[PDB]
């Protein structure tokens, strides 16, 4: 209460290492100097320092004392690993961005607070990393653009955690409608039909299904399409749908 911590430090030093290490750990963190026990016992690869979670609203502890102590006293990459080993969603972002260790960066930027989420997102644009930026824009605010960038980087699990917030179709409807526009541009049938079914556009898959003069299944001509009859002309019946029948016989199917 007189803005002082000296007797706490003296007590911590008095029986610091006599099997009474808990005494010094008590009388150092309150005193502000727990470095000496790191030199004594956490130089012995005390990898973690009891990271915590919510007690009333949230509480935490860290191996970061160990880390920044190492980083100031030379063992900087040891500190960076200790960011993972303190689960540092900030120093595994920030001080693992200063000394880049992606075993600490991405492990502590896969699911990190938007503040550090963006801070690894804005850290990772210039490396040609749309994945990193999308993997750092999952709670970072960029989501629909992050659907678009995931469409550049072909990310869908990263886009899964992007669209965790919004429409969880592993995507946005802009991406699926872009895919629909492509598949109608290609004129391809089956992937168009499947994706529009997945993107809830059965009507667009209808105009490509039964008049495609291909084999038509129960959904493919009955779910959206009203008729299982791909034969609309008697000449088509005897030539094209006859070939469809011969193919479906060669398919081993008996119904179509």
């Amino acid at each position: 209460a007189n803005d002082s911590r000296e007797l706490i430090l003296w007590w911590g030093k008095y029986l610091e290492s006599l099997g009474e290490y808990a005494k010094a750990l008590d009388c150092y963190r309150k005193a502000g100097d727990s470095l000496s026990m790191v030199r004594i016992h956490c130089f012995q690869r005390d990898w973690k320092a009891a990271e915590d979670e919510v007690t009333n609203s949230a509480d935490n502890a860290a191996s970061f004392h160990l880390a920044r102590q190492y980083e100031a006293s030379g063992r900087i990459p040891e500190a960076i690993r200790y960011y993972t080993l303190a689960k540092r969603y900030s120093h595994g972002v920030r001080l693992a961005k200063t000394h880049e260790l992606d075993s600490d960066l991405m492990n502590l930027a896969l699911k990190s607070t938007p503040a550090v989420m963006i801070d690894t997102a804005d850290y990772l644009f210039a490396k040609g990393q749309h994945e990193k930026a999308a993997t750092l824009y999952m709670k970072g605010g960029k989501l629909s653009k992050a659907v678009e960038m995931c469409f550049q980087a072909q990310l869908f699990d990263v886009l899964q955690h992007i669209t965790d917030d919004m429409t969880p179709e592993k995507s946005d409807p802009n991406l699926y409608n872009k895919c629909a526009e492509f598949f109608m541009g290609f004129g391809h049938n089956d992937k168009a039909v499947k994706m529009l079914i997945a993107a809830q556009q059965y009507g667009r898959a209808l105009e490509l299904c039964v008049e495609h003069d291909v084999s038509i299944t129960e959904e493919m001509a009955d779910s959206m399409t009203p008729d299982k009859n791909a034969a609309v002309s008697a000449d088509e019946r005897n030539n094209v749908i006859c070939r469809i029948a011969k193919v479906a016989k060669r398919q081993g199917n008996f119904q179509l």
């Binding site: 209460a1 007189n2 803005d3 002082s4 911590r5 706490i8 963190r29 309150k30 005193a31 502000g32 009333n56 609203s57 949230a58 509480d59």
Partner: protein, 95 residues
Amino acid sequence: YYAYEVVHKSVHSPFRTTHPDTLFNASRFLLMRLLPPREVPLGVSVVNVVYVLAKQAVEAGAFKLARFAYNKLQTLVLPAAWQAEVDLASVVIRS
């Protein structure tokens, strides 16, 4: 007990526990809790607490409370071991 120990003890002897939802609602509404004679252990100095609490009340909005915390920013003094210097550094050391 939270506010006094956590923030006043930031220089005196460090001991901090926080509740981020409670501290965010504090960043919207905290300023008026810190009067001395309102269900308090008493004997508590809140120099750091007044300063940081006023800043927190200013920051996150509730623009009434930002102005109120401007009126209640910090005017407090470090203890008597610091009396020879915080006589001049009462307003200086913590705004």
